[PDB]
Design a protein around this ligand. Structure first.
Ligand SMILES: *[C@@H]1O[C@H](CO)[C@@H](O[C@@H]2O[C@H](CO)[C@@H](O[C@@H]3O[C@H](CO[C@H]4O[C@H](CO)[C@@H](O)[C@H](O)[C@@H]4O)[C@@H](O)[C@H](O[C@H]4O[C@H](CO)[C@@H](O)[C@H](O)[C@@H]4O)[C@@H]3O)[C@H](O)[C@H]2NC(C)=O)[C@H](O)[C@H]1NC(C)=O
Ligand SMILES: *[C@@H]1O[C@H](CO)[C@@H](O[C@@H]2O[C@H](CO)[C@@H](O)[C@H](O)[C@H]2NC(C)=O)[C@H](O)[C@H]1NC(C)=O
Ligand SMILES: *[C@@H]1O[C@H](CO)[C@@H](O[C@@H]2O[C@H](CO)[C@@H](O)[C@H](O)[C@H]2NC(C)=O)[C@H](O)[C@H]1NC(C)=O
Ligand SMILES: *[C@@H]1O[C@H](CO)[C@@H](O[C@@H]2O[C@H](CO)[C@@H](O)[C@H](O)[C@H]2NC(C)=O)[C@H](O)[C@H]1NC(C)=O
Ligand SMILES: *[C@@H]1O[C@H](CO)[C@@H](O[C@@H]2O[C@H](CO)[C@@H](O)[C@H](O)[C@H]2NC(C)=O)[C@H](O)[C@H]1NC(C)=O
Ligand SMILES: *[C@@H]1O[C@H](CO)[C@@H](O)[C@H](O)[C@H]1NC(C)=O
Ligand SMILES: *[C@@H]1O[C@H](CO)[C@@H](O)[C@H](O)[C@H]1NC(C)=O
Ligand SMILES: *[C@@H]1O[C@H](CO)[C@@H](O)[C@H](O)[C@H]1NC(C)=O
Ligand SMILES: *[C@@H]1O[C@H](CO)[C@@H](O)[C@H](O)[C@H]1NC(C)=O
Ligand SMILES: *[C@@H]1O[C@H](CO)[C@@H](O)[C@H](O)[C@H]1NC(C)=O
Ligand SMILES: *[C@@H]1O[C@H](CO)[C@@H](O)[C@H](O)[C@H]1NC(C)=O
Ligand SMILES: *[C@@H]1O[C@H](CO)[C@@H](O)[C@H](O)[C@H]1NC(C)=O
Ligand SMILES: *[C@@H]1O[C@H](CO)[C@@H](O)[C@H](O)[C@H]1NC(C)=O
Ligand SMILES: *[C@@H]1O[C@H](CO)[C@@H](O)[C@H](O)[C@H]1NC(C)=O
Ligand SMILES: *[C@@H]1O[C@H](CO)[C@@H](O)[C@H](O)[C@H]1NC(C)=O
Ligand SMILES: *[C@@H]1O[C@H](CO)[C@@H](O)[C@H](O)[C@H]1NC(C)=O
Lengths: 128, 440, 129, 446, 129, 441
């Protein structure tokens, strides 16, 4: 329906809008060039947007999720991060609410995803 | 039983600061710089079942607006002629031609030496000056007030500085959120919010004491400050209806120009046609009185049921904070406000005439290392502005408190238009427990 | 052939030239820095080339093609887009001519590709759970 | 029974406008700026079964030449001595020694006050002027000022800097390509079938001149005339010759350049003394060569205007020298040649070179832009150069008399119209590698 | 071991650190970025070049059909014209620095072979579908 | 038999040049323009079984430091008041008031006119200054020494130029490697190496003759030159001990100022409080002799056990070439080092070195610009650490060679501090043989 239209939707309900959010990330110059600061300042902002985009893509590659909007892993979920029931997580809560609740544990999760993929690629190469 | 599933494109965000890009609807300075066109698209998304917290007193956009404005102002002046060749002794006497008692010594007829197109030649000229910009040296010897402290640059006469509405637009990866709660005071949670592509068109209006040409409150009068209890805070008042103010400089000025160098033209005030009288501004007494009565009722809601509101003028300081200021027709006005703040509120119609002063050497933007000369404008100037708000300060359980108009950062004016907007960064990744396991 | 050597070739004839075109999309000093306007213009140009590149890659990912040069999808070809023989198109039309043949349908096809892929991923997720 | 097939790496493009950068093959401004090296490989690929439309009048590269050339010019002059302190009352007299009757009072001997390293001292300087640079103060015939004291500050050019144009190659940024037309008979504004790809253009030498185009590409096969909206006399005519015409230019007098200090770290240069009988500048063209060349031009325009026409040539309308004379730089000096002698003929169906007198100026405005000025310091000794006329700019009077006689004059134009000639050969396009087509396959779904 | 935790590791031993090295690329004060024009520009240019470098390598892996994998087994044979080094040493006596130096002469050849082999297989898959 | 296997994330590199970003910890120009904080977390990785080739004279990190320092200096002077309008004729006489140390003719009392805030007004003013800044025109006429050559700019009094440690950090995609071998001689295959994200801080101290406030050597004094037998190359001496040098500008001073325009202030010397005294630096002779002893031993190791090392003073030339030079208290000192190089070696005692003060400074061995050093009030004192020397062998086969304090360009100070470090580019892609063919469906 629009960018962030699903922000108030439940986590499950918002899953089919992941594509709109992705499309909007990369979405009189004869005068403006003359202003050195205007030029540099705005160019830097554009460059940073690119850098952020690429870092997230780099991570999806590392975790083995680059080809999917939704990516299952072999890393188990820890009750330390969350011991809430899936029915509340997916049907009642929104992503804004839910994500805030696990803001401590994100780094832990990322490290686990990276290692799991590392071992799986090794296993494939040894098998071949 | 559960595994970490990665979700990309998740509709969430975090508080953020980023540079915004300036766009106009479309040879004015604002328009020349803020030349990026806006979209013909009133894009807004209602964030149904989303609550967000706003705090206008911490809003980064105000600081950016300020910074960009200062930069533009200077950029406009960078290619203009310097008047430093004119930092000479002036031989001044009082003007007595058709001058009334409310003027007397305000105008001076000064003569001086200045340069010419050729380096070796000099010329003698006569010019009319306002007392505010001329200082006695010690007799008849006077100088321009700022030739001791800073260089004076003449603003280019061809450049229009009148404000145009400006829309600020988010860079990709960012979004502007807006509070649509009509009763929102700028600091609490807001439960009626939507996304924004670009802000509305905000005019970069500059004034002191009274706010001009801003938005009006739907909800009568809203009085807000970072902290009401704190006696050091400057209170902003937003009105639901404007008060019109009619400003003028009645004198018909004759403008002439002389070269001081090959591409350097100096514009001088010349002389005056007709009678010489003070500049002034008018408002309706009742309109002003009705407005204050409502403000007082709103003040009691914060200051007490038996509280008596005493209005008074500012406590002191320089011209820039003791008078109301604006730039009507491009001339800089410094108008008295004591006529607006004399009464005490307790628990075809007459107008209020505010006398005004005219100044040409301006220390712009609360800075002191720069000065500019405002070229005089030929003829007679009139305009009418919309007073949309107040800039107020206040001075042992007396039950009576005193409120005064005052100065402050220009940022404080801009805080009003930007009070309803917030900048956030979009964060597409997150994870969640699910019952799937990656196929091995 | 070289870069664009295949530009005058027909659609099928240009098969296997996709690789040269892809390779060529990505590629004193004191003057380059001192002349500020010069330096800005040149840096902007490289940045723009990158931005362009990324948009195309993003779309291929969105549509489920990703790193492939040659993809086939679940979206049908429409009579509202064209009514020409398949061999006419593949053996005789020039890729340049072809773009002229299909004009102002790009956004339709892309919307279809985007939605189809979105549903396909959801179906896979349900099956695995 | 067809689906969508998606391809990336499709060899297609669309017209586009982008920023180009320059390179060269190695004091010179062009060399300093286009410091980027060239690739010796032509990298030109002929395409088969290719057609493209080239409209030189809409070629943005022409605008870029103008924009960047001016920018370089300004950057090169910027870090030099300002002569502002010298735009003062000048005392003058006419030169009466070793002067021919062609010169008479054109050359003047003037004196003035000048600054020194210490602000407390003043010196007195004598120098020569060519009249065009000096006017009467307000009318006294002893007191003069420089022509620019009422308009702009003048900066002298730094003497070490070389502006000699060099061939410059323009190269596409990644994502872009240049297409080239090699159709020998192509007149612009239209389709071309002899199309090949280009990575970098040939080296175009940025020669700046007015009425006649010097040292450009020479036409292949035949004299060709290119113009847009030809019946409209508001447009000028660009004529490209297939045979060059040699023109020998000189500044015959021996100039002894002198220099003095003007302030801390700064030198001023001036004309000093002149040795030998003093004459104006001159340019020679064989009259026979000129007449043969012109007849060839006449034949080409005749096919455009009619078999029964008479082609009359006439000299230009009045106006500034930058319009009315052949303005060019020779040896570093600025020449303003009287070309009326090249147009005094009507065409109806040993060399005795035509010699044009030429004026010289020291105060130069630039690019038909005003409010800025450059001082050209004099060059020591005697100057000679030889140039190749490769094309002409002409205008037609127009009107309707139906007399069958058309009148042509030296045309005026923009510097952009000189560059327009070399650039008629090239077009810029953007590469668009992504596209779709129908297919009998469907994605395999499992 | 950390980023570039060791470079004395044998090529085999270093295979489990590929994910570490992979994370290095793209890994009031700020007012100075505009106050000093050249300083801000030089830094920006450096960041841009790092990005450009990153993208070229990623494009190349995509072209070869390896894409996001850190290790790929391809359809290109190792040539006999290349130094006849013993496989036991290649994986457990040799480190990557030593190895690459020994075989650096051939880099552009092997890349051309990788590109062509993948292009051919992709075409064959389209014919099979 | 073998196929191709492709690897990404390969731990290899190639030598490369780039631009390294400037950072610092904790009105100081170095801090202001290297605002970027350092990482408080130290970082280093040892690379066992890795040997790398270093060459301190081919190290581009030095050139970057040179370029950036000069740029910084110029950028800092750009917004300061110009003194151009003060290039007027001076009328000067000799000052004998409270003359001491027979330093006659060093200072002159000059009267001159200046332009003040209004263009209509001129003022006769007076100032006291050094002969090194003034020349005679030929109660005689004089001018400042640099008025013919260029504009003079006053440095802003509020800006501190005191060197602070500066750390250089690699951009992503690059790494800095360092040599940890205590006996490394500046070139070759250093076997004790590690990877470093940021260098240690280096103070950008600029001096001539001797190297001050640098790093000390471990082990023993290490002497290094690009070519040893080419007398055109100077040899760097890195000491393993620091010699204390106590410098002063003994006079007390009154500083005066005047407006020369609209907000334009000029600072000048006023007058001298007490006796006029020569500037000087003190070094213990004994420690100096011990230091020379260590050095001559190291020199003999390259020339022979029986050679004779003759020390001698610098050749004739400009003060910036022949005397010791440093910035102490904001004043610029030029010191006579001939007293340090008189002995011949073969198998309190504080020496006082006289010094002179100059206010108009040309810098970086560049000509065409000059910086006016504002006067410093009061009395100046500092003590510096001598950590090294720049010497020349001066080219008979008599076995006696003369070593002179030839000095060198600013890069030598930087070559010394940045010698440890090398820059390389990370290259994650590579290939090797395997046993499998890609699995084919
Ligand atoms: C169309 O094309 C022709 C051919 O290229 C151009 O003709 C040349 O024009 C340039 C610019 O006017 C001339 O440049 C001058 O060259 C001198 C040296 O050449 C002589 O001496 C050498 C030996 O040293 C001989 O080989 C040579 O044949 C000549 O006899 C310089 O001394 C001149 O002085 C300037 O440069 C020197 C540095 O080299 C500085 O020290 C001086 O102060 C000063 O700046 C000058 O560079 C060139 O000689 C001409 N060539 C020929 C063959 O005649 C036309 O100008 C061009 N037309 C247009 C419109 O662009
Ligand atoms: C411009 O400057 C001139 C001097 O250069 C002034 O003229 C003198 O004024 C004094 C009085 O202050 C008289 O005693 C002199 O006789 C005058 N000299 C001449 C030649 O007239 C002049 O008054 C100044 N003018 C202005 C407008 O400032
Ligand atoms: C100020 O006074 C001048 C002088 O009369 C006015 O100029 C006149 O303008 C009218 C048109 O508005 C002309 O018809 C007159 O001829 C002008 N006067 C002269 C000198 O010829 C000017 O308009 C006045 N300006 C204002 C705003 O009052
Ligand atoms: C110096 O030469 C100029 C010509 O270059 C003389 O100007 C001419 O003066 C006569 C008499 O007034 C006019 O009729 C001409 O029209 C003028 N010529 C031009 C081109 O305008 C000038 O008089 C000479 N001066 C001296 C002292 O001989
Ligand atoms: C400052 O300027 C004044 C003049 O305005 C100089 O004083 C004059 O010098 C000349 C020299 O030829 C004497 O003939 C005059 O009698 C002096 N006049 C006065 C009033 O003294 C003065 O010398 C200049 N100051 C300096 C230091 O050079
Ligand atoms: C908000 O809540 C209502 C139920 O009260 C529900 O019908 C609606 O879909 C919710 N909005 C969003 C964005 O989830
Ligand atoms: C969960 O996290 C805690 C640390 O907070 C750790 O000790 C525990 O082992 C983890 N359990 C699982 C299943 O990951
Ligand atoms: C973990 O996150 C919660 C919010 O979800 C926060 O209240 C809590 O303090 C965090 N714990 C730590 C150790 O940061
Ligand atoms: C000029 O005006 C001032 C201010 O009103 C007054 O004090 C002064 O006496 C007046 N002088 C004359 C001559 O009228
Ligand atoms: C506002 O400031 C006053 C002190 O000036 C303090 O007593 C009061 O509690 C503050 N109010 C809030 C809401 O912080
Ligand atoms: C305020 O008004 C009083 C008169 O009641 C006046 O004397 C005083 O100067 C005024 N001050 C300011 C700052 O307006
Ligand atoms: C779309 O393209 C067709 C040709 O393929 C053309 O006929 C039609 O007019 C175009 N529509 C638009 C955008 O006008
Ligand atoms: C040049 O063009 C003319 C056009 O009239 C033609 O007659 C002549 O033969 C051509 N010259 C050459 C060398 O082809
Ligand atoms: C260095 O070589 C020895 C002997 O083969 C080995 O045990 C050690 O692990 C190696 N060092 C590194 C960093 O791999
Ligand atoms: C200043 O000292 C020099 C010697 O250094 C002498 O020649 C000169 O005459 C002295 N001048 C005065 C005024 O004493
Ligand atoms: C010094 O340079 C000379 C050549 O000038 C060379 O023969 C000699 O070997 C060099 N010495 C050293 C120690 O590099």
């Amino acid at each position: 329906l629009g960018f962030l239209g699903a922000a108030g939707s439940t986590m499950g309900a918002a899953s089919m809008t992941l594509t709109v959010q992705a499309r909007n990330l990369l979405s009189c110059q004869q005068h403006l060039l003359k202003d050195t600061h205007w030029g540099i300042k705005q160019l830097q902002a554009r460059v940073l947007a690119v850098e952020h985009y690429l870092r997230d893509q780099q991570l999806l590659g590392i975790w083995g999720c680059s080809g999917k909007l939704i990516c299952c892993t072999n890393v188990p979920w820890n009750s330390s991060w969350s011991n809430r029931n899936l029915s509340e997580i997916w049907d009642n809560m929104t992503w804004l609410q839910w994500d805030k609740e696990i803001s401590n544990y994100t780094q832990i999760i990322y490290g686990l995803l990276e290692e799991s993929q590392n071992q799986q690629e090794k296993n494939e190469q040894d098998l071949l | 039983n559960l595994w970490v599933t990665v979700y990309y494109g998740v509709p969430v965000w975090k508080d953020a600061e980023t540079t915004l890009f300036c766009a106009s609807d479309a040879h004015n300075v604002w328009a020349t710089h803020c030349c990026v066109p806006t979209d013909p698209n009133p894009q807004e998304i209602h964030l149904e079942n989303v609550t967000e917290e706003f705090n206008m007193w911490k809003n980064n956009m105000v600081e950016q607006m300020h910074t960009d404005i200062i930069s533009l102002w200077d950029q406009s002046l960078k290619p203009c002629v310097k008047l430093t060749p004119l930092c000479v002794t002036l031989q001044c006497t009082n003007v007595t031609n058709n001058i009334t008692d409310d003027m007397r010594g305000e105008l001076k007829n000064c003569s001086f030496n200045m340069t010419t197109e050729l380096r070796d030649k000099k010329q003698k000229v006569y010019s009319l000056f306002y007392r505010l910009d001329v200082v006695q040296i010690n007799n008849k010897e006077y100088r321009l007030i700022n030739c001791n402290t800073s260089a004076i640059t003449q603003a280019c006469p061809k450049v229009s500085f009148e404000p145009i509405p400006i829309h600020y637009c988010a860079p990709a990866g960012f979004a502007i959120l807006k509070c649509k709660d009509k009763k929102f005071n700028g600091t609490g949670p807001c439960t009626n919010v939507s996304t924004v592509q670009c802000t509305h068109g905000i005019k970069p209006v500059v004034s002191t004491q009274l706010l001009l040409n801003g938005s009006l409150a739907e909800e009568e009068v809203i009085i807000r400050s970072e902290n009401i209890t704190n006696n050091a805070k400057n209170i902003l008042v937003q009105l639901n209806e404007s008060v019109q103010i009619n400003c003028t400089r009645p004198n018909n000025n004759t403008v002439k120009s002389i070269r001081i160098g090959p591409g350097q033209w100096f514009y001088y005030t010349g002389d005056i046609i007709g009678d010489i009288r003070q500049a002034h501004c008018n408002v309706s007494k009742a309109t002003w009185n009705e407005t204050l009565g409502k403000v007082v009722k709103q003040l009691r809601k914060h200051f007490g049921n038996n509280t008596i509101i005493r209005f008074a003028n500012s406590s002191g300081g320089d011209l820039e904070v003791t008078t109301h200021s604006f730039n009507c027709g491009g001339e800089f006005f410094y108008c008295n406000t004591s006529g607006l703040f004399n009464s005490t509120w307790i628990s075809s119609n007459d107008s209020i005439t505010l006398p005004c002063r005219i100044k040409q050497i301006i220390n712009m933007w609360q800075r002191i290392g720069q000065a500019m000369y405002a070229p005089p404008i030929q003829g007679v100037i009139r305009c009418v502005s919309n007073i949309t708000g107040l800039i107020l300060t206040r001075d042992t359980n007396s039950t009576t408190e005193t409120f005064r108009p005052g100065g402050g950062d220009m940022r404080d004016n801009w805080r009003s238009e930007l009070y309803k907007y917030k900048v956030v960064k979009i964060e597409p990744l997150g994870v969640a427990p699910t019952r799937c396991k990656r196929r091995v």
